Amino acid sequence: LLTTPVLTGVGNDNRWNGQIVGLQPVPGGFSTCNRHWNLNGSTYGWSSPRFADIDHRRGSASYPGNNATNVLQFWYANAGSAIDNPISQVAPDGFPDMSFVPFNGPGIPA
Amino acid sequence: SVPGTTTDGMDPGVVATTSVVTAENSSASVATAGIGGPPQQVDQQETWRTNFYYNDVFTWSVADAPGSILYTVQHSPQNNPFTAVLSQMYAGWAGGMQFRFIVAGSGVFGGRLVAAVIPPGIEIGPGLEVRQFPHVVIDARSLEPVTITMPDLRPNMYHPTGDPGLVPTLVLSVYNNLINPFGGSTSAIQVTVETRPSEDFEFVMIRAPSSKTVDSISPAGLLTTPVLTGVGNDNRWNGQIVGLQPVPGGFSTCNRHWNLNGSTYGWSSPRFADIDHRRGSASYPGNNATNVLQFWYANAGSAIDNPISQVAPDGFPDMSFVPFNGPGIPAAGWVGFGAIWNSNSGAPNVTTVQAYELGFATGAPGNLQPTTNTSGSQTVAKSIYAVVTGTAQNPAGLFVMASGVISTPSANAITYTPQPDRIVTTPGTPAAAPVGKNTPIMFASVVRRTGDVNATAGSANGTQYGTGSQPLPVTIGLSLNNYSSALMPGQFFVWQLTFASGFMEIGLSVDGYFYAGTGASTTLIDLTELIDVRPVGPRPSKSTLVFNLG
Amino acid sequence: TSVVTAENSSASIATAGIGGPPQQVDQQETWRTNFYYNDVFTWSVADAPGSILYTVQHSPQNNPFTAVLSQMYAGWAGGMQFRFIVAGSGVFGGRLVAAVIPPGIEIGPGLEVRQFPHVVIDARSLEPVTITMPDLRPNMYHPTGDPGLVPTLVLSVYNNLINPFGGSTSAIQVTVETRPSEDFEFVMIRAPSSKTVDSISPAGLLTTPVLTGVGNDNRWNGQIVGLQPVPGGFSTCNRHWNLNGSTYGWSSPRFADIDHRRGSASYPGNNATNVLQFWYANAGSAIDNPISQVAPDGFPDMSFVPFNGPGIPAAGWVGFGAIWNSNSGAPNVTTVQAYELGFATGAPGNLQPTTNTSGSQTVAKSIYAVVTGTAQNPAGLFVMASGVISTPSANAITYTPQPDRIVTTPGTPAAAPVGKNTPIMFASVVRRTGDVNATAGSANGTQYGTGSQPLPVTIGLSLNNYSSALMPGQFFVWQLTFASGFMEIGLSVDGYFYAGTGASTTLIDLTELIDVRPVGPRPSKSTLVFNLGG
């Protein structure tokens, strides 16, 4: 499963679909759930092992303010409701496992 | 000597050994199996172990592609009738067995078969190529029988009856296609299998007769002859089953369904008692509370008192709500006699006892829409007749009888209820898929209707058939016993119903669904002349079940 | 270990050669060398000397392993060895005799077992006593299917049992064990799927979950949670099937619907607003029911309660239903209510409860107000078979129905106490109208609805015939195991259930019940045990 071209020039990573260049040590520890498989043929996440479109329906859409030119767009939906995956219904297939950094106004988030 | 066309009961015929019958296998099998004590039932003069006795039969068609399996058995004492009788009073076995094949063909046909013995660790599946194992090829024009011996290759010292472990498997498949040079109507032949224990077979530990085991008994005892032609009801209504009808495409009904493993598909423990709730809003349209239609709804997740799942109350019908407005009664659907009752140690209201239509709505109390998914929905009920008093309190509940009827305006032909496009689906289910020519089957019965009280099976307009998934005696027989090892996934347990002019075979997979070889027909098969039921065994899903009806 | 052979063994081997060579004859087999359990019986302090306590015929069914092996052989011959183990105590006294009776002699009260060749068994013996029964037959072998003449082993009382200590304990259990003799054999192997005619037994109808899981009664589809005894007797015949393939009454066992077509309808009051609808028809007009003409299927078998005004009557049978006209009828929109069903007489004048079916008349009076009231002569009822019980206030009234309130037909047998045994009556948790949330917790006791037998049993017994499975004068007996006690239950030939509780009216809860186990047919003079945790 781990050969020489996998870590040299062919393999990608399971979060960003990008070329693996290095190794990053984490001395504290972490837990990754989405698109992650154990040695039992099982997953706890909500994504298949492939990179495709994220599609969901039945979610409330709104926009702040009153003027409708150059206005930020908002959309949300609850967890546990997305009936599109045979795996689990926590989130639709392909949703990133990152916490939402809050922002508003003319500032690009970090 | 006998001239080849008559055969004795102790005559094997020709002997075919592939590569696994060796002297060291038998010498290691005899010497190591002495850990159970002295061997029992070992006497090479008894009648039960000198003759061949009947085990099985199967058919070989012209349209069978090369590489398709016609016969498979695991190594077991269930492959001979007398060792199956003797295994109830012993707790261990070792040794091999012999299999005699007689082809009932003529010298004008063509085609070959192939047989092999598979080692214990290999998975028996789609990617198994048995022609790349040591094998033996049998012609279709053979007159004398052919005997194949399967030895005992095991990593343990003996086979406990409740836990044998790893066993070999005998596979028989098509080598070359069957050819009839005249063509026409004759396109199949039959092969009969006999069995006989080998010389190194024995039992060890005496135990008690009909002792319980850590494994599981075969699922043949639950489906007997009074279940079909007598007592036995549906999963949604308590009515006797009358007929058998196929569906094209498949369905998914997941209310009171139990798998082969002991597990339920959500709520609704299997007993037709009642429906009760303690939280839920009540309202009524219009400015006047006189001759109105009551409106109760609550979200999915408010069923605290249900001990299985929180999504729905116990005994609720799994029907999508058909939206209706006005005095015109809805078509089909589920309607039951009920009333309302208030919370905080409250008596039921006297003035409102009426039949309500039950279902799941979307977007209540505004525009109500039918729904297919149970997650993120809200259960609902509204009356079909006019009541004289309405309640508008936030804490309220229901009291509905579990037995129900169908509501129809016209009631001449309608449609069998429910349809596969109407049955709701809980998260986490496997759906029915028609494999081979076999189709999913749903049991039919007779349920009364609101449009006509006298719904008798006879004249005065044709009768209406309600469809339920599995019988209630069958669901009781699976709610306790676990069958993880009784039937391997990938095949089904097949019975053999016998009518007065024909016979059909019905199956039961690991998913709890029933299969029949109906093909592309939607004809109701009335079960009135059915006499007896005899079980058969585990058969692969690619094989076709017979449909001899007169 | 020594194996005992019979006195007639050399003539027994030779004359059985008409069936071929002997089968399953290997003297080192483990199923043949050890003793295994067969049966159990009771020796009482009230048994007169010369009374018979145990009787068994020569058969290959008095052993757990020869009964399995007889499924694949059409014939048997040879002897069989018996062993007796007394539970006993060192403070008891009395002896017993056991002898083998040849064919042609009666087994009865005039049999003098003490002048046959016998063995003596002590009431305080620790080591077991052994006796061998030979195969004394007038045939060459015994074919399975029609054996012939066999000897019989008879156990009798020599000296009566004595307890000088006093009260409490007055009965001893004796266990029988069996291994075959050296000369026993089988002949002529056969198909195991062949004649499946094996002593049909009413043991598989009452299993474990039936009482600690699924399982309902004949009045309601409610879970059976407790048994309640009643001293004196009762009579019920609605869904009550006896051990033959017959019953006395209507209502085949399914809680589907209650449907009738013809019957008069009326209502009191000169105003057609907020009244109680009253439907009534006489007994004998149920043409659509193929079983009995007395009542439609699903009608309750309790009497009417005479009430008037806006007060909800105590107890009874209330069910959610409606009225419907005839002539390919659709039901009326504006009348769906809870209706109280029962048997009465003298309607629509003085409504009185009645005991007997004959001379009575079925009635249906609504308990809640309905806005419209019809008066058409052809009318019927479409009521769900599952219902509740009406109550004025929540409280806890009593178990319903009472044994005097049950309506029975002419020609019905009655349950009667025999000895200390008392007929019991299965109970269940049900809902009511005085309090919808009938949780089995706090806020007073819950309502109990009581029926005759477990509906499951009726379902499994209505197919088969049990005429020779239980000899008359006995019960088929089970042994219920609790966590800190055990009990014993009976089933008569007439369809009733008994327990040896005596004259007590305390409910027994099936909460810590673990499993059940069949015992067999036992005489009714023996008291069933009541060693409960209290």
Curated annotation (Swiss-Prot), chain C:
It comes from the Viruses. Transmembrane segments: none annotated. It is found in: Virion; Host cytoplasm. Capsid protein VP60 self assembles to form an icosahedral capsid with a T=3 symmetry, about 35 nm in diameter, and consisting of 180 capsid proteins. A smaller form of capsid with a diameter of 23 nm might be capsid proteins assembled as icosahedron with T=1 symmetry. The capsid encapsulate VP2 proteins and genomic or subgenomic RNA. Attaches virion to target cells by binding histo-blood group antigens, inducing endocytosis of the viral particle. Acidification of the endosome induces conformational change of capsid protein thereby injecting virus genomic RNA into host cytoplasm. Homomultimer. Interacts with host type II histo-blood group structures antigens at the surface of target cells. This is Capsid protein VP60.
